[PDB]
Structure formats: C-alpha cells, structure tokens
C-alpha cells in the first residue's frame, strides 16, 4: 500500500480485502508473495574471487618487487647474452608464489565473514500474524510476511514490517522508535487517520515502522509495506559502513605491528645500502644498474615476506572461530568486540528463576488448619507427588495417600487455587505431554487442583485433553468470578470476587478469594477456617502457621509458598472502585486464613558446579531473586553461593534494605553483596554502576523491557533466549538455553579464545623475526646469500599457509580457568613475551645462516671447507692468492641454499609445536593434541621433498637434494628450538607465574 | 558443521596445483 | 681368425686345423658354433609397446587438448565448484580414449613390420661347404657356417662369409665388391699373401667379403670371420635408417594430406574464433576465460580426430599385405616401391626356355639317311616315347616299335650323342625318379641313347641305378674322348676328338664328332653317311634334310633340333690349337652328315591363358628365345603371342638382323616387336632403353650374370628363383617358380593393391571431411553443439579402428584386369574423386547436425519442438518473451546428442560398405563379400549399444538410450548415403569409364 496513515482503518482493510478476524488466505498469501516478494532487504551481490586477488596485487611493495624483477630480467639479455633459463623463469615463479599466497588470504576472509554472518542463522526474526489456516496466533519468519496480512504485536516485540494500527488491545500503546525517529522517549499511538499524506515519520502516530520496538501494551494491525518499501528499508540503501569502532586489542595490535613494519623497513633499506660497494662487481654485469637491482630485489622481497601482514586479520580469524564455538554451546554472540571483554569478566549478576533454576513449577506441600483450642494448634500437612505440569500424582498424608475431598479445608484450598488463577493447562499431542498456558506459578496451581479433585469427579473416562482442566472447570461451575483485584508488589497479593451459580435472591452469599505472600495475607486475617467452621486468629495460631512457612522456605527444598484466604463478609459489590490499586488492600481485609501451598522450582543440576568454577576463576556471582530474604539466602547456601555455616548479614539485602542505606553505604554494599531479594528494576542499573566504580567487568542477566537500561549499562549484557526482543537488542549476548551454566561456559570461551590469539601472534611475529635476522646476518657478516627471493617467498607460502592456519584448531590451554580474570588494562605483548619473540626469532635466523656456513666453514663430507674468510667471497676471482684447490664458482653451490631452506622449514614445524600452549610443556601438552597441525606438518614436508626431487623444480629453485647425513645435521640444528622455548616456558611458568 | 577439513585440503591443492603449473610452465619455454 | 690376408694359405689351414680335402668335422662344427656363434647379425630389439605409446603422447595437439581439459576442471572445483561427476571424469576419459587409440596405431605398425621382415623367410641365404659328413659339396644355411670350414664359390654366387682364398679352380677369378669397396668394376683375386696386415679392404686381393658376388670364375677357400666380425658386419653396425627414399606416389599423398591439414586448421580456429560473443554465457559462469577454454577444447578436439595423421602409413599397410599375398603366389618382392610400379607394367620381356616352357627336355624324333641315289633321297624317321628324363620308352618307325641297333645310322647317331655329351643321368631313391646331371639339352640326349641301346646290352637285370648310364657307358668303352672343342655361338656347334680303345697303331682310326645347329653343321658336310657307307653330299640331299628340319621346327611341336655329323679324316693330333675358338670351325669341316635329333620342351599349360590375360590388360608380351627365327615365330604363334595367320615380318628380329638396322630403325623396331631370336646379352639393355623411350613400364626377365645390367635398367627386373644370386640382387622381384604365368599374377596383384589403397583413402578422407563439416555446421548456423569432445573422440576410436582396418581384407575389384595399364603419371586423387570425397563427407556432416535438428525443429514424440530460431539458443535465459512452455536447459538434453552420435556411427558403417569396391555397386559387389568388415560392423554396434545401456557409461557420455521409432529415423537418415555413393559410382562407371 501507500500513505496508509492518511487512510482510515477500514480503507486499509478494504484496500487489501481482508477482515481483521479472518486474516489472509493461502491464496492471497501466494499472490502477495509473488506480487510483492518476501519481507526483507535485497540479498546483496558481494564480491568475486577474481576481483579480490587483483585488489591484493595493489600493494606498493608487491608492485615494486614485481616491477624490479621485470627490469632485472629485461637486463638479462644485454650484457653477455649467455645461458638464462632460470633468469627468465624467476619473474614467473614470484608472481605465481605471490598469487597462491593471496588466494589463501581470500579463503581466510571468506571463512571469517562466513561464521560472523552464520550467527544470524541461530537467531532469526519472527512475527505474530493472523491467517486463514487456524484461528489463533501463528508465529512465523518475518520474511514470510506479505504486505496485507493482519499482525499482532505486544510488549517487548520487534516490529516485523511497516504496520497500520488496526486495534489497540491494551489501554495505551507506547513505542520505541529510537532506531528511526531518533527520539529516545517512547511515543504514543492511536487508530485514527493522520490527515496530511505529505506528512513526516514523527507525525505518523497510527503507524508502526519495521525495526521498532513495543515499549508498552498490545495492538493489532495490518501490513502496509514490506521489503525495501519499508520506512527502514529505504534507509539501508544509504549507509554501507554502519560500524566504525576498533576493539582496544586490534588497536594495540595495529600499533605493535606498525612498529615492526617500520623497523623491518629500516633494516630492509640497510641491506640494500650495506651492499653499495658491490654494485660494480662483475657477477652483476659490472654495473651500478644491475648491482643496485640484485640487492633491491632482496630488500623488497624480505620486506614483502617479513612485514607482519594481516595482523588485525588474526583477531578477525580468532573471533570468527570462537564465535561459532560459543554458539555451538548456546551462547549467541550479538556484539563481536564483547568476546574480548568476555574473558575479563569479574562479576555475574544472574536472575534466579529460570536461569539458576528450571522454572518447572509444581506444588510439593500444602497445609490447612486441623484443630484449634486456645494454645493448641494442629496442622494438616500434605505432600503431592509428581513435579511435571501433568495432572498425574497423588496427595499423601504422613506418607499414605488420601482422598483430599474428605478434607473441607482442602476443598476451600483447592477452590481458591482454581479461582485465583488466570492460567490453565494444555495437553500437547505431537509431544504427548501437558504444558502450561500462562504463568508457571499459576499453572502449577491448576495442576494441583487437577490432582486433588476435591469433588471426586470422573477422570479416567476422560480423554487426555478433557482431563487437562476437568476439576478446575467444576470449581468454576460453583462460583462466578466477577472481577479480579490483580496483584501489586505494594501489598504482595491479589483477589477475586465471586458469586454462587445456583442463587436467585442472595444478599449474603458472595465471597472474596485471596492469594499472596504469607507475610501480609496472614496479618489481614482475623479468622482461621477450621474445616467448615471459623475461629478467632489467636497469636499462637499465627505463630504455628508462620513457623511451618519458615520451615519450608528454609528447608532443603527452599519452597516458595503462598497463603490462601477468604473474606466471608465482602464489602458491597458497589463500594468498590476498580481503578486505584491503593484501595485494594483495604478491601482485602477482615480475612479468614484457609491454607498454604508450598511450591518448588529446583535449581539446575549444573549450576552447582558452574558456580564452583567461577570461584576457581576468580569471578563473583551475584544472585538476584524475587523470593524473600530468608528463602533467598537459603537458596544461596543450597547452590554454594554461600557456605553452609558462614555469615551473610552484610552480603544479602532486600530491595528495601538497600534503599534504606545512604548512597555511600550502597556502593560499599556492592563490593561484597552476593544476594539481592525483592528488588526494583532500577536496582539492576545502580548495582552495575557501583560494580563499575570498582573496575569490575560485569555480566548482567535480563529479559524484560525494563531490563534494557541495565543491560546496555553493563559490560556484558546477557538476555534470555526466551525473553523480550527489546532485551536482546540491548544486550551483547543471548542465552539460547537461558542457562546460567552457559554464561560460565561463555566466559571460559573468552579466556580460551584470548589464548589462541596469543598462539597465532607468537608464531607469526617470531617466524618473521627469524625471516629477517636471516637475510640480515648474511648481509652483515658478508656471507653468501643463504636464501634467494624465490626460496624465501616459497617458505613464506608454506609457513603462513598450513601450520599457521592449523593453529586455529588448538585445544584450550590448561590453567585457563585457574587464573584470576585478566585485566583489560594489561598490554597484549608484555616485555617478557617480546623477549620470547626475539630469542626464538633471532635463533631461527642464526640457525639458517649457520646451516649454510656448515657446508663451508665446518663443511663435513662436502666441498668448500673454507674454514675461514668465507666472509670475503667477492675477492675470489681477482684476489685469489688465498684459494687452495677451490673453484670460485662454489659460492653458487646449490647445497648451502638447500641447507638453509631445509632447516628454516623444519624449524618452523618445530616452532608450530611450540605454539600449542602459551606456557605448557610439550610433555604436559603433547604434540598429538592438535592432529590438524600434525597433518599440516606432513603436507608441508611433502611439498619440500617434492620441490627437491622433481627434476624441473630444484633446478629453478637453486636446490639440490641432500644426503641422509646432512638431514641428520638439519635435525641436530633445528630441534634445539624446542628446547629453547621449553626453557623459556619453564621460566614463564615457574618464575613469572602471572 | 565445521568446514575444518575442507580448509586443509584447499590449502594442500593451491600449493599442489601451482607446483604442477611450474613443471608445466618451465617446459613451454624449454622446448 | 685375424688378418688372414697377411697369413699364407697353409698358415690359415693350420690355425684352424683342417685339410682342404677333409673339410670340417661335426665336432669342430659344434665347437666353433659355440666358440663363435651362428653366422648372422644380432637380432635388433627396437622398442617396447608402452615405450612407443608414450612417443605418440607427444603431439602439439595432444598436449594442448589434454592440458585445457584439466585447466577447465581446476577452474571447475575451485571457481564455482558445484555438482560435477561428469566434469571430473571427462579429462580422465580423454586420456583413456587416447590410450586405446595408440594401441591400434602400434598394432598396425607392428603388422606393417611383420609382413615386411617375413619376406626374408622366403629367400634364405645359403652357402656351399665342404665338411666331413659326405665327400661331395653340401648346400646349407649361411647361418650354419662356422669360421674355419672350407667354402666353395662359383659364378653368380653371393659370398656367405669372409673367406680366405685357398684355391682358384678357374683360370681367373673376378669379384663384384661394389657393395663394400664402392668400386663398380670387378676386381681380380689371387691366392698369395698380402704383406701389411694394417692394409685396407681394397688391397686384400686374396680375400672374399661376405656380401660380395662372384663376377666370374670358381674358387675354394676357408672361412676366417663370420657374423659381426665380418667386414660387412662391422658396417651394418653403422646405419640403421636406410629408408632414405619415398615413392613419387607417397609424396603425392603426403602433399594432399598436408593441404587438408592446413584447411582443417583454418576452419578449426575459425570455429573457436567466430565464437567470442558467447564467451560470457551464464552456463560458462560468465567467464571470458571459461568460455575460451570450452570452445578451445572443441577446436583442438576437432584437429586430433579431423587431421589425417597416418596417411603415409596407410600406403605401407597396403604394400605389407600386398607383398605377402604376392609371395604366397610365388612372386617375392625384393623392392617395396616396385609394387606401386608393378601396376603400371606395360611390357614384359620374358625368356622362353624354362619360363614360357617347362624345360623338360626330351628327344621326340630323329632321322638318318635311308638311301641316296643322285636325285632320290629317302630318310629314316623315328619317334621316341616318354618325355621324362627316365630311360624308359620305345623307338618306333611308322608307329611300329623297332630295334634301333639294327640301323647302322642310328648306331653312329647314338655314338655322337653319348660322346658329344658332358651331362649324365641320376636315379634319385628318395624321390624314386631319374633326374638330370648337367644341362637339360644334353641329358635328354643321354636319355635317348639309354632308350636306343644300339648294342643290345642288358637292362632289366640291372638295378634302377645302373640302368641310368648303362648304354652310355658302353659307347664310351669303345672311344676315348681325348678333348672337346666346346660350343661357340659364332659357329653354332661343338665337337669331340676320340681314339678307339683296343688299338695302338691307328693313326688312321681317330674320329671327330660334331653336334650343333643344322644350318652351319650341314654346310660343312661333303658326305652323307648311308648306314656304313659314304657318298658325296648333293644339292637334292641337303634339300631333303633341310625340309624335314623345317617341317619339325614349324610343326605343332616346334622342335628344337640338332644335326649330328662326324669327321672321318680329322686333322693330325698336333695340327690343332686348343686356345682360340676362331680356329675350331676350320677343324670341324669336310664332314659326313649322320642324322638329326629333334627335341621338345613344351610350353607351360597356363602360359597360353596368361598371355591372353596380358592382351586384355593392354600389356604387350615380348618373347626372347635362342631358337632360330623360324621356330621362334612358330612358338609365338603356338602360344598366342601371334595370330595363327597374321603377318609378322616386322615384329620378329634376330640378334643379327637387329644389329644390321641403323639406330633410328632399331628404336622403331621395338615399338611393335614381340619376338627376339638369337640375341646377345647387350640386346636386353638396348631393348629396355628403347621401350623406355616410348614411356613404357617394362618388366624384363633375367637369370645369368650378364643379365644384371638390363635387370638393373628395367623398371621391373625379374630374376628366376633358380638363377644366379647376382641376377637376384640386381632385380626387383624373384620368381619362386620361374613361371611366366606368375609374373602376370604379380602384375594383377599390383593393380589390386592400388585399388585397396584407393579404398582406404576414400573412407579415411571422406569420414574426416564429415567429422569437420559436422562441427563447422553447428558453429556456423549457431546450433546447440551436436557433439561434445568425449563423443567425437569415441566415434573416432571406433571408425578408424574396426571398419577401417577391416577394409584391408577387401577382395580384389572386378574390372581389375580389363583396363589398360595405369599411367605412373596420372595423380592419385583426381578431381572427380575429390568431388566424391566432399559429397559423401559433407553429407554425413549435414546428416549429423540434422539428426539433432530433428529432435528440435521437427521434434517428433520429443521435447524441443521449437520449429524456428533454435538458432539463438543463447538468448533463452535472458530474452525469454519468446519461450512457450519450454525450459531453456533443454539445449543440454541428452537426446539430440544421442541422435548425432547414433547417426554418425551408423553412417560410417554404411560408408565402409561403400568402400568395398572403388566403383562397383553393392549389387555387383555384395556386402557379405568382406566378412571381416561385416564382423567389424557388429562389434562397432555392440560398443555403441553398450555405451548407451550400461548405466555408468551413457551418463559420462551425455547420452540417453533412444526409442525404436527414433532408431527408424536414424536409418531413414543414414541409409541415403548408400544411395548417394551408388549414384556417384554409377556416374564414374558409366560416364567417366576411365
Ligand atoms: Mg612472513
Ligand atoms: Mg525473572
Ligand atoms: Mg577420425
Ligand atoms: Mg636362358
Ligand atoms: Na553493555
Ligand atoms: Na631394375
């Protein structure tokens, strides 16, 4: 449609041709679906493989190197047109090595973007529509919404498409349009038409814009526009870069990598400078042109291989993989930078019901008054069996089943439960189980009555479906629920007014039924029903009731119990004002106590240990519960948040008690508070605030609309997977399973991921340092180039190709959850770590040039044998009164080069094994822990032997296959890297613990 | 799901292929 | 031995230890046989099956194609790697196909080799050796000759091994060492030792080099070296590629295929080239590069099957199987090019005796003088029975047997025959038949005396061996043959000088016995013996004799008869000089005529018809005979060289007569001459030469040493199987049976082979032009490709695999021997022929793209049905306001492809049946004539059905099994090829007869 705001409600129902009762028909559905398309934005093209490789070849250095290799090949004809083959082949080698080194990059970024995207797969946008199929609400994918069908939205929902308001089901509707209108404050809506069709968004107060949130209320509506036609869809074809922020980890990494980039460059120009006195040499055509080019290539090549390339990418790759793992474990990472923070988590405020517990509500116990005589007060305690919402169980007295119908007290009890209820039961057939229809509390109540059957009604001759609300129905048959004085936290209770069914002229026959917290309900009682009788509420009676309530709430079941009461002489049907909540407590007085139900929702099995794990990890857990202070502390003891016997007077507050503290004392409270009971929505925010004023990194749970403020405030917002859409959008992470344990897993993932990122870094940085100390050590000591450009770029293609990416599959480190939470202040690369980097790096470099020097200086079973002055290998042709039976052309033997290469590669596979754990020995963390890496070591060694034995290759690579003896030497020279890092590890492990 | 193994095979073939194109390309100027 | 030339005759006899009379001993034989090895060269290995396969895998095209078939697949898993199955298997099938292609190639070259080498099996090299076993000469394999044994060589022999000359039996010894020494002129040899051992071959004039020929003489010797130790042997380890020539016909063909190649290249990269505006199609992943590859694959996949590779090899195939048949018919083809000539043979000069006739010599008739009285002259004519050399028959007079001893004339007659004789008889036990020992003429004479028995000596009581020479011995018991004045063509006669046995003092008792041609012998007679008396020779007597001789020589027996005379008063024993021939006729004068022997050698039965066959083939036959002019012409008439009555005055010349013509007249004589009598050796050459001057292709028979020159001159030199090895090495073909008829058969085969060569060509060329226009037609009318590469190359592997090779088994054509000899001038592929190749070719191509067009435009009982614009199938995905219920992805239906393939294949089988005869209708030449081809048709169809019905197959091949109705369409589309060719055949057959 168009200008649906300008039209009236009917003019819209008309335009599409649908009643706000029927909803759309499978036909119109398929029709609109084809005429309009799915409700979504156009799945953008993207980019091609071809294009990205090209974009890779846009590097100055890459161009430079490649251009200079073309010029020096173009000058391979002019001075002495001799034998070239390899001199022609070099340029084609480089550009192919480079090509394959870039293709690998695409695989990484594709893989990166992929996982990040693939998270939305876990949490798709839904909607509430009315259609022809069934009469009731159908939850569907927002993309499957056709402009025209009838939509229903409620508190905390996200608007699936642009809707024209049909009918406001609640008394007021409020909407958070912040995302579009910009206005933070929630705007009210109506169902009337807006005049001016040339009007603006902020003026369309009968419209709901896709991507907005329902702050308060419920409404019905008809879809006007979908897809790009949306008021939001017409803005997402505007900005492409809606994210411009850098996590302080990449920021420090781009700082560090930039520092290396600079130094690497300097000692890269230095190499081309300390060789000016050799530009003229004959072996370069004797020209400053070919002289200054054979070293220029070396310079640019080293730089191309040693400059730490996609260092930020390493974080991107690492977050990618962590992400998918967390999601696998039911932790949906909304905001990416959050994971970095997740490691540093130091506090978790979790809600109790449903997160720490199952919210599998069921009535375990219940008592009524047995006999009262002055100081004599007997209770009729009962237990009920079966913890599922299933109306299958039995009512036992003293461990023997009884007929609850034979207890007048229980008849009233069950009457109040059925009539103070707004929820009911539903037997599912596909699943074959009964399940709630309303709040779990009330549904447990419904189930209670279905087990009690105070009227001995039939059951077995009823279908599984009729069974569901059988005894409840019956109870409603007797009384007529007129209206309900719903619950308010100010009085901690609720009530219903009821009139008998079979009564013509009754003036005294109406009753009020009350249900609520024991505390106050009992205080508003002057009579204690005894079967059918009633007596005065004595002090002792009140004492006996209370002690049993206290018993059960403190027991090893920590029951949340309700008091049930009736008012027998209710004030006039008319004297009652059904608007102000302040007058309800006034009507709900002069009561007769009936009984008490004790109900249970058990803690999740895992919670127990998960808590312990946080203790070990140095992470404080703070429970936030709606139970009273008593039961609340009890539960904390019961789940290990508190010791069995330890003192907690200053570590557990009610909302009230908190508010009674002055501000300074409240801040004080949060440094040690572990339990909060009966709080206000605002308290979440303040608690976070205070927690922050201590430099704590806090994770805060929430799921409601009034949770959003505190969730956005917290460092890690955690919304429940079953909670409001408002909550989720405001949080940085969603619990698929609402499980507290999951949150703890999520934190462990943060730590782990942080470690794997360190693994990658150590390996790259260090291998590159070595890549440079190599080519510098040869230039400095004047030695024969131990590696040529083609060889170096090859080694580069293998190292940063297979083992490196295979490190992505490192298992989690050991001490991971036995450390205190990392500070988000401590730097990424510490001084020690940098020492570690240099040591190892510098060592591989020296081990490479020394492998080459081994074939000369100390040359065993091989040519050269020039123990000394292998240094000045230029004054060989000219100044040869020093040569003794040695051909000058030996400095171009393909054996030292094959030594260098055959050691650097082996030493990298070793260094890869060193990068399994950040500190743990290969004897405490064996190499076969990462089979992926071990497989990568094989493939790498496959390629090396092949480039040495397949005749075309070793020729162009200036390499010759080596003898078993010389291979043993390679090992005798590489393997000490493992030992070096092992020493360093043992120092970092036993001397610098943290 | 884990496309883990596809990751090591693709990076084993990109360095397999470009080496096969070295045997090949060197001989087209040899002849 | 070593340097046997430096050693003396005895120093060699010694070194091995053997007497030049004993020969070697069976012990010494076996010993040297192991100490030295078989006398031969080491059988070359060559190459291996697989080792040659690889060689075929080296083509520019096979590389390029087998490259961009994997480039395309790497760009298939890694660029847009979707569901592939077929995409991976395609390259891995191209090579699989190519493997099975080479297998046929190598098999054919193997078969080509086998036939060739299998020719030496027919004519094994022999040697004459003296050994211990028997006392007479022993004829053996040259390989069974051990360096050391005693070798005998004679006029016209090949020297079997390197021999040291022991003893020269003749007065001089001449040797043709041309083959090794390079010296054309024959060199003389001696038995003396050559000084310097370090001397050269040309100087070793006491040596005889294996591979050389005895130009004149006879000698004895001892073997020095054999095998690779030989002076020829050490040279045969030099050149391996001694096929440095190609027939003017091979070139004329390589030239044609080269033209096609060039055109097949143009209209191949024109196929790919015109397909650029289809590089970016969506089915190509929209890639300039992917599109180029795909069409580039089609281009090269054409070339590889389209360009005719093994044309020069097809010629060889033919010659191989031709030669083989020829050899099976007793015509051993020494020279391979010769066969091609053999077809064009226009003239055959054959010798009469032995080749036209059996050379089964026997005396039929004989006369002596009965009575002479001035002008009265009576003869005593006799007939003898039995034509075999067996002394079993009877002498009749007037059809009545008589006792020859009772006629004095006959007594002397037989005496002259027995004493003017150098041959004799021998009874073979194995065979159990009598056989000649010397010249047939003379032996037939020995047989006559044995049948006559002029002395009534005993016969029956003698063994079958003693009978052999009984009466002959007797006659020799009477006279003592002192010496013989042997025959000289300048006097046409010979004589012996005899003295009686028991008689010392008989200076008037010695006699001279003359035998020779009647002509001159009779003229040197002044007396005519009448029984025991003598009378003077009158004019009338001489006339009676001569008339009877003429009658016999011209009769229906065409007898070659000799006159027998005696000199009664011979010159003194000393007056005679036995050095100069010139004086012999002077001695043989003043004679007494005794009688005449008339003898027969019948013409071969077949000769008659063979001549007729030559008349039909438009080939002229020239008889060369030693008979006189009269008898010669007679014989010619008798065998159909001449008509019974026709005038021949200018078509028959004697040596003499020819020489009396001036040079211009001689050249003229040859253009019509058909009979040559009493010619010199030189006349063979001159004749050839003149015949050449009329552009004749001449066949010339020869067998003696002095025949070599003319045999080398003639286009087809034909040596007798029973002749000098000098004649054989000089000639191009050897007559296993010396039969004139065999020559004629050889020419027939020459014509046939040329035809089969034509067959093969037509089929290859045509099918190929088809294979091209198919892929050009679909690329020019822009159709959906009718065939894909894997299909094409499969068809190619079958077509050039089973039907093509089975054509090698085509029986000879029909008009074969009814046309005139083909000109070596006329080209192979004529204009008409080319038109014939294009027609059939361009047709099958059209029928293949049409076969697909039918599944679309005229699509019956099948999808497509797009009557028009099937052309622009690329603008189907995009510009589809033209589609009517048609899925664009139908252009890749597995049906139109199964049409093209299922049509092309069937039309090739048809085209193969067209290639049974070059011009003859399938009704004149039934298809069930070549069972092998017919068998190839079954198997070809067996593979086709299976590649469509065994599930793995039709999948990989982009094929779906078709329905019986559509198969009828295939037929209804293929079979009009039969008709088309049949039309063109009828045209050439009836309009372009020749
Ligand atoms: Mg690097
Ligand atoms: Mg809650
Ligand atoms: Mg072919
Ligand atoms: Mg002869
Ligand atoms: Na937050
Ligand atoms: Na010749």
From TrEMBL, chains A, C:
Its cofactor is Mg(2+). Its EC number is 7.2.2.10. It comes from Oryctolagus cuniculus (Rabbit). Belongs to the cation transport ATPase (P-type) (TC 3.A.3) family. Type IIA subfamily. Catalyzes the hydrolysis of ATP coupled with the transport of calcium. GO terms for cellular component: sarcoplasmic reticulum membrane. It comes from the Eukaryota. This is Calcium-transporting ATPase. It is found in: Endoplasmic reticulum membrane; Membrane; Sarcoplasmic reticulum membrane.
